[PDB]
Amino acid sequence: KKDYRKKYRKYVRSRFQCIEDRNARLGESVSLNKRYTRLRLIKESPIKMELLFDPDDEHSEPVHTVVFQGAAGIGKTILARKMMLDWASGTLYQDRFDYLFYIHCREVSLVTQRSLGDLIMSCCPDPNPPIHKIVRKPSRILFLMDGFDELQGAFDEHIGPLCTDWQKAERGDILLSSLIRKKLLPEASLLITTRPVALEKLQHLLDHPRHVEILGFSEAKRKEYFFKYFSDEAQARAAFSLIQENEVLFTMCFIPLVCWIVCTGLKQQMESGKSLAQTSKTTTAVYVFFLSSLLQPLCAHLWGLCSLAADGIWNQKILFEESDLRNHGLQKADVSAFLRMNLFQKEVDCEKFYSFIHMTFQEFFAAMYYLLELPSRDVTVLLENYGKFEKGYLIFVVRFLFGLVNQERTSYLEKKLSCKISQQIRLELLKWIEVKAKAKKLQIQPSQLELFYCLYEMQEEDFVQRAMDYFPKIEINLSTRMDHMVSSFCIENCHRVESLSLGFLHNLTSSFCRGLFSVLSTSQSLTELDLSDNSLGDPGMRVLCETLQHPGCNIRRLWLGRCGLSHECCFDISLVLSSNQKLVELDLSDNALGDFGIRLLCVGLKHLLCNLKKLWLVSCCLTSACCQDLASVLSTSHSLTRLYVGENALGDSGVAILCEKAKNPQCNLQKLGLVNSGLTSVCCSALSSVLSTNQNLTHLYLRGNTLGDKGIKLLCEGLLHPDCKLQVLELDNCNLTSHCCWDLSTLLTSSQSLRKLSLGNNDLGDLGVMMFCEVLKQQSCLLQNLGLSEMYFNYETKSALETLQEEKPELTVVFEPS
Ligand SMILES: Nc1ncnc2c1ncn2[C@@H]1O[C@H](COP(=O)(O)OP(=O)(O)OP(=O)(O)O)[C@@H](O)[C@H]1O
Ligand SMILES: CN1CCC[C@@H](Nc2nnc(-c3ccc(C(F)(F)F)cc3O)c3c2CCC3)C1
Numbered sequence: 087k088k089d090y091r092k093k094y095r096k097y098v099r100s101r102f103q104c105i106e107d108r109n110a111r112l113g114e115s116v117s118l119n120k121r122y123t124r125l126r127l128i129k130e131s132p133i134k135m136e137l138l139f140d141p142d143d144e145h146s147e148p149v150h151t152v153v154f155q156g157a158a159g160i161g162k163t164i165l166a167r168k169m170m171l172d173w174a175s176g177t178l179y180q181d182r183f184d185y186l187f188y189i190h191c192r193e194v195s196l197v198t199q200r201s202l203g204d205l206i207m208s209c210c211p212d213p214n215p216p217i218h219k220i221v222r223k224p225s226r227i228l229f230l231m232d233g234f235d236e237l238q239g240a241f242d243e244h245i246g247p248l249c250t251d252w253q254k255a256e257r258g259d260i261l262l263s264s265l266i267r268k269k270l271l272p273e274a275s276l277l278i279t280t281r282p283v284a285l286e287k288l289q290h291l292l293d294h295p296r297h298v299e300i301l302g303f304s305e306a307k308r309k310e311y312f313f314k315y316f317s318d319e320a321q322a323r324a325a326f327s328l329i330q331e332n333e334v335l336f337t338m339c340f341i342p343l344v345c346w347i348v349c350t351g352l353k354q355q356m357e358s359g360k361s362l363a364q365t366s367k368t369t370t371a372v373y374v375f376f377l378s379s380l381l382q383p384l385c386a387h388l389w390g391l392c393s394l395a396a397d398g399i400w401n402q403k404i405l406f407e408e409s410d411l412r413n414h415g416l417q418k419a420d421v422s423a424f425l426r427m428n429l430f431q432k433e434v435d436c437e438k439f440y441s442f443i444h445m446t447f448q449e450f451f452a453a454m455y456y457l458l459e460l461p462s463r464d465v466t467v468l469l470e471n472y473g474k475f476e477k478g479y480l481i482f483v484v485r486f487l488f489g490l491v492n493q494e495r496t497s498y499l500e501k502k503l504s505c506k507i508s509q510q511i512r513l514e515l516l517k518w519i520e521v522k523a524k525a526k527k528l529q530i531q532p533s534q535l536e537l538f539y540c541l542y543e544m545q546e547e548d549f550v551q552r553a554m555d556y557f558p559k560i561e562i563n564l565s566t567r568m569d570h571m572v573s574s575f576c577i578e579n580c581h582r583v584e585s586l587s588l589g590f591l592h593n594l595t596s597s598f599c600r601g602l603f604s605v606l607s608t609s610q611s612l613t614e615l616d617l618s619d620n621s622l623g624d625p626g627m628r629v630l631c632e633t634l635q636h637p638g639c640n641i642r643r644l645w646l647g648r649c650g651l652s653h654e655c656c657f658d659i660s661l662v663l664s665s666n667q668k669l670v671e672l673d674l675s676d677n678a679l680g681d682f683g684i685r686l687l688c689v690g691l692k693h694l695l696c697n698l699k700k701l702w703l704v705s706c707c708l709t710s711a712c713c714q715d716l717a718s719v720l721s722t723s724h725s726l727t728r729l730y731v732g733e734n735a736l737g738d739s740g741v742a743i744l745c746e747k748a749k750n751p752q753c754n755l756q757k758l759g760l761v762n763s764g765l766t767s768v769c770c771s772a773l774s775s776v777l778s779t780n781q782n783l784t785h786l787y788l789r790g791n792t793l794g795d796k797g798i799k800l801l802c803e804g805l806l807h808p809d810c811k812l813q814v815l816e817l818d819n820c821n822l823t824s825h826c827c828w829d830l831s832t833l834l835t836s837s838q839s840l841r842k843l844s845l846g847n848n849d850l851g852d853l854g855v856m857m858f859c860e861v862l863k864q865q866s867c868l869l870q871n872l873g874l875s876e877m878y879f880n881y882e883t884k885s886a887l888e889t890l891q892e893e894k895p896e897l898t899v900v901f902e903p904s
Contacts, residue, residue: 090216091184097210098186099174102167106443107435110425112353123303123311123342125165127154128592130297135169136178138298139228139275149296150268153278153288156300158446158482159343162279165300166232169277183275184226191232192404192441196239196259202252202270204229224273229265234280234288236445237262238402240476243290266291283479283530302340302566311342315349324362325352334367337571343444344372351376354427358383368543370489373450378498380427385499389458390414391430395442395451399483400461402476404448405439449482457490457503457511465514473531481536488515489543516552523556535562535569538576547579554580563589570601578605587616594626603629607636618647624655631658635665643671651677660690663698673702681712688715692722700728704761710740717747720755727754727782732761732790738769745772749779756782762790767797774804781811789818789846795826802829811839818846818875827854834868835861844873852883859890862897871899878903 101107104117111117127133141148156162166188172178173186188208209215220226241259248264249256252271264270266278266288278295280288288295303311309326316322329336329348339345352362366372381388394414398404411417421440424430429447432440442448456465465487471477472484490503491512519541522532532540534557541550554576560583564570577583586606590599599622606612622630627649634641651659656679662669679687684703690696703716708731719726731744741763748755758776770793776783793801798820805812822830827850834843855874862868879887884902891900 089220091220093210093212094185094215095174095176098170098188101435102171102174102188105164105167106431107433108431109434110428110431112428119168119171121311121314122164122168123307123314125161126301126304128299128301130299131592133298135172138277138296139182149294150273151266151276151278151292151295153280153292153295153297154300155280155282155285155297157302157341158281159341159444160300160302161342162281162300163232164342166230166277166279170230179228183228184220184223186228186230188230189232191234191236192238194237194258194262196237196241196257196262199255199257200261201255202261202265224271225275227271228275228277231262231266231276231278234278235284235475235478236404238404241287243287263291267293281479283481284475286530287475303342303345308336308339308345311345312349316353321353321356325349325356328352328362328364332364332366334571335364335372337567338369338372340567343446344369347372347376350428351379355379368489368545370450370486370543373447373486374490374500377429378500380429382498383427384423385502387416387420388454388499388502390416391420392451392455392458393460395448396455397461398448399452399478399480402478404445405433405441407439411440445478446482449478449480450486453483453486453490454503456487457507459504459507465511469514469518473529479530485540485543487511488540491515491544492546494545512549516549519553520556523553526559526561534560535573538562539572542572542575550576550579551581555582558582559585559587561587561589563591564602565591566593567598570599574602574605577602578608580609581611583609583612585614585616586612587618588620590617590620590622590626592621594621595623596625597629599626600629603633606641607633607639610638610640612641614643614645615641616645616647617649618645620647620649622646622649624650624652627651627655628658631662634662634669639666640668641666642668644669645671645673646675646677647673648676651679651683653678653680653683656683656686660686663687663690663696664693667695667697669698671700672698674706675702675704677706679703679706679708681709684708684712685715688719691719691726696723697725699725701726702730702759703734704730704759705733706731708734708736710735710737710743713740713743717744720744720753721747721750724754727756728759729755729757730759730761732759732763732787734763736760736763736765738766741765741769742772745769745776748783749776751779751781753780754782755780757785757787758783759787760791761787765791765793765797767794767800770797770800774800774807777801777804777810777812778807779809781809783812785814785816786812787816788820789816791820793817793820793822795822798822798826799829802833805833805840806836810837813840814842814870815840816842816844816846817848817873818844819848820846822848822850824849824851824853827851827857830854831857831861834858834866835864838867840868842870843868844871844875845877846873847876850874850877852879855879855883856886859886862890863894866894866897869896869898871901872897874901874903876903 103119105119127135138152139149154162154165169178170186170188173183187205189204205217205221206213206215215221239259243263245260245263247260248267248269249260250264250269261270266276268274268276278288312326313319313322316325329339335348339348348364352364356362364375366375394406394411394416398406411421421430421432425432428443430440431443456463456468462468468480469484472480491508519537522537541553544550557580560577562573564573577586588602606615633639634644651674691698713736716731720729741760765788773786777786798817804810805815822845831854858872887900887902890897
């Protein structure tokens with residue numbers, strides 16, 4: 087006679103009022119979830135806490151599945167709890183979902199066979215809810231899978247027997263897969279929280295997810311967290327100030343877990359009348375510091391604890407029974423000690439399982455196990471399984487293992503580590519880096535950013551430098567301040583990096599990136615800097631321009647890409663060209679360098695001592711109005727030899743102006759990249775004058791103009807001139823047809839300077855090609871690709887071309903279409 091939804095909501099509202107559903111809450115005080123600090127959500131572009139499933143603007147298409155992703159300790163699990171509570175309180179999705187079902191991926195194993203009893207297991211104490219009634223209705227429920235990457239057991243996407251029908255019992259991975267794929271209870275919305283490392287598995291199940299990334303605390307939010315943690319503002323201020331001075335620790339504290347660990351550590355020593363010691367710089371240092379302060383005041387059974395953690399990692403166990411603790415010599419002692427000073431939790435949510443505070447802690451202890459004095463005790467085995475889902479990726483186990491190896495160590499727990507073992511681990515870790523650094527493949531295992539963090543953690547100059555000698559190239563993507571901090575350290579200590587690519591991600595449009603650019607200026611060996619495909623807008627270009635004026639810059643190639651360069655920022659680029667004596671190549675493609683921007687660039691290019699040799703201005707929205715300045719550069723500049731100005735709005739007068747100055751016999755222009763300049767037959771005579779006059783012009787690219795048959799005739803007259811030295815002529819779709827084939831045939835026999843001639847997607851016809859085959863037999867000087875790309879023929883012509891390829895081997899490539 088009563089509506090179960092009311093009781094369900096009450097149960098959820100009462101249950102989800104604890105951060106970790108645990109005891110040992112600083113004397114088991116009220117959790118007070120009001121302490122929650124707002125996390126920012128970014129759509130893979132800020133998104134509201136609500137409207138996560140709502141339809142987008144395009145086609146009003148709704149999303150059933152939403153996936154949250156983020157770093158360990160970012161608070162994925164807490165955000166999920168907050169949503170659950172806000173719903174139960176009638177604030178979030180008040181009119182969208184009747185039930186929210188929390189699934190703890192730490193509790194649900196894959197091996198055990200079971201029906202979809204999740205709707206009962208996570209509900210109120212009443213064992214017989216109305217499953218067949220309102221609970222049955224699709225589109226009215228939301229599932230929350232919290233910690234996909236924490237699932238214990240092997241998990242494959244390759245499941246045939248998905249087994250729909252909630253009434254039937256099946257294996258956990260099968261049941262899970264069916265729900266994720268929306269085969270089980272179709273139209274049931276699903277929210278997943280996971281570390282990005284598990285996306286390699288989810289990508290095959292989600293099909294059409296919406297992705298949202300979770301960010302950590304902002305500077306203002308960090309302040310709020312620290313204050314909320316303490317009852318005494320004076321203590322919060324003293325603690326905040328200490329951390330703020332430690333720039334490195336403060337940076338790390340953007341992760342909620344890190345600031346939690348730091349706060350707890352400081353509070354515990356504060357209560358003892360200590361001066362608030364804290365010198366941690368690395369993630370490992372924070373965890374070591376925490377355990378040192380916690381256990382030092384105990385550690386006799388630390389080996390057993392480390393063994394327990396190591397066993398759990400290898401045997402796929404997060405939750406432990408009292409029987410498992412007893413089997414490690416842990417009974418009626420350690421558990422109590424770890425509750426008086428929270429190190430280990432009982433998860434007292436009407437349950438008898440024990441666990442670590444966080445998976446990060448469990449991995450820490452497992453790593454510690456490898457440096458002491460029984461699943462392995464072999465680092466080789468540990469490393470070989472690093473990238474495997476089945477072992478939880480072992481990211482922190484290894485990352486901490488690196489951090490725990492050093493010479494600059496003291497007392498307090500870490501003194502119990504064996505020197506001989508540590509030295510052996512160091513050598514094995516270095517060999518591991520060499521192998522992974524060389525194996526430059528796309529994968530979740532080390533991909534040139536993580537081999538870096540796993541180095542930062544070991545602040546030893548000799549080790550890091552030795553490792554860096556295996557990194558001739560660095561290709562990384564920086565997401566947050568933490569990546570900039572690590573990248574800066576690593577790059578600064580590099581001596582043999584020749585090529586660096588920094589794919590900055592949205593945080594730029596700020597001075598934020600300054601922290602890394604200032605490092606590049608001190609490099610002695612860096613040659614190529616690639617800053618393509620990122621929003622290095624005006625202020626980004628400005629800080630880089632300052633960086634590039636440094637006397638120790640030593641950068642030769644500046645490959646800017648779609649940076650969104652504007653009219654004004656080009657000024658700063660000019661100031662680099664006129665000062666920097668080493669820069670050779672510059673690529674400003676796909677920017678808004680309008681006529682104004684080019685004029686400024688040209689001022690720099692005409693400056694004495696500008697040694698720029700290759701200039702790319704492709705797709706720069708250029709018009710004929712600016713060709714006058716580029717023409718002046720070609721005339722006066724002795725160093726510029728390669729110019730690419732295609733994919734612009736140039737006209738006939740545009741190229742003719744460049745030609746009138748480029749024809750000068752003292753011009754050093756070698757490559758004229760008029761790939762797509764909207765050229766017509768009228769302007770061709772200008773190109774002809776240049777070809778017969780410029781003895782340095784070896785390559786002409788007209789791949790996309792509309793030269794036409796009259797145009798090619800005129801171009802031929804130029805090319806046929808005895809003083810023309812052109813080696814490569816590229817004529818892609820120029821709207822040429824059979825009517826001009828007689829001149830192209832003549833060109834092949836009369837011009838002795840050409841080595842390559844390539845016709846592209848144009849209907850030359852069969853007559854032209856057949857003639858080519860015969861004339862090319864007459865001791866032709868053309869050896870390179872004949873082209874005729876994307877052009878198709880009958881069988882007779884194809885046979886002739888195949889014959890040509892074999893009959894005269896001197897022509898390396900005929901390039902038949904098939
Ligand atoms: N908004 C917040 N307010 C207060 N504390 C927070 C917040 N977000 C995260 N924390 C801190 O994060 C810690 C919990 O980390 P959490 O369990 O969320 O990691 P996780 O990656 O979600 O783990 P799992 O993947 O197993 O769910 C808590 O100790 C808590 O203090
Ligand atoms: C994910 N994976 C591939 C991409 C690059 C790299 N990314 C990160 N890794 N680790 C942490 C990280 C956070 C917290 C703690 C601590 F809590 F233990 F201190 C350690 C960490 O190592 C973070 C990031 C980015 C966000 C914070 C590794």
